[PDB]
């Protein structure tokens, strides 16, 4: 309903504060988004 849209790179971030971190830990992110383009012609 209110998509994350920064104008600035990084104004907004997704946060995870881990309790325990094993060797080779990582976050695999997945995103759904809308984005244009430069022009539209009729």
């Amino acid at each position: 309903d209110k998509p994350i849209y920064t104008l600035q790179y990084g104004n907004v971030g997704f946060v995870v504060n881990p309790k325990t971190v094993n060797q080779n830990a990582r976050l695999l992110m997945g995103y759904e988004y809308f984005t244009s383009r430069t022009e539209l012609v009729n």
Partner: protein
């Protein structure tokens, strides 16, 4: 034709085309033609121009001849009735 935006149909076949040949020329034909064999005035056919009879009429010639000759026998005389 349909054009669809944003995928538009190129506005031409452009300048990247490969001219493949200069063979474009039809060489004009120049010629002198003579058909001159002696002609003889006649042809032979089985029949030309006839309107053959499908049936003829009957046809004839004529003759007569003779004389006037005769042998005769007559009725007898009778009594006359009246008058």
């Amino acid at each position: 034709a349909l054009i669809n935006p944003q995928f538009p149909y190129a506005g031409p076949v452009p300048i990247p085309g490969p001219a493949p040949t200069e063979t474009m020329p039809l060489l004009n034909y120049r010629v002198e033609g003579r058909i001159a064999g002696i002609q003889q005035a006649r042809q032979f056919m089985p029949f030309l121009q006839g309107p053959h009879r499908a049936v003829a009429e009957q046809t004839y010639h004529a003759i007569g001849t003779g004389i006037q000759m005769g042998q005769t026998f007559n009725q007898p005389l009778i009594n006359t009735q009246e008058g």
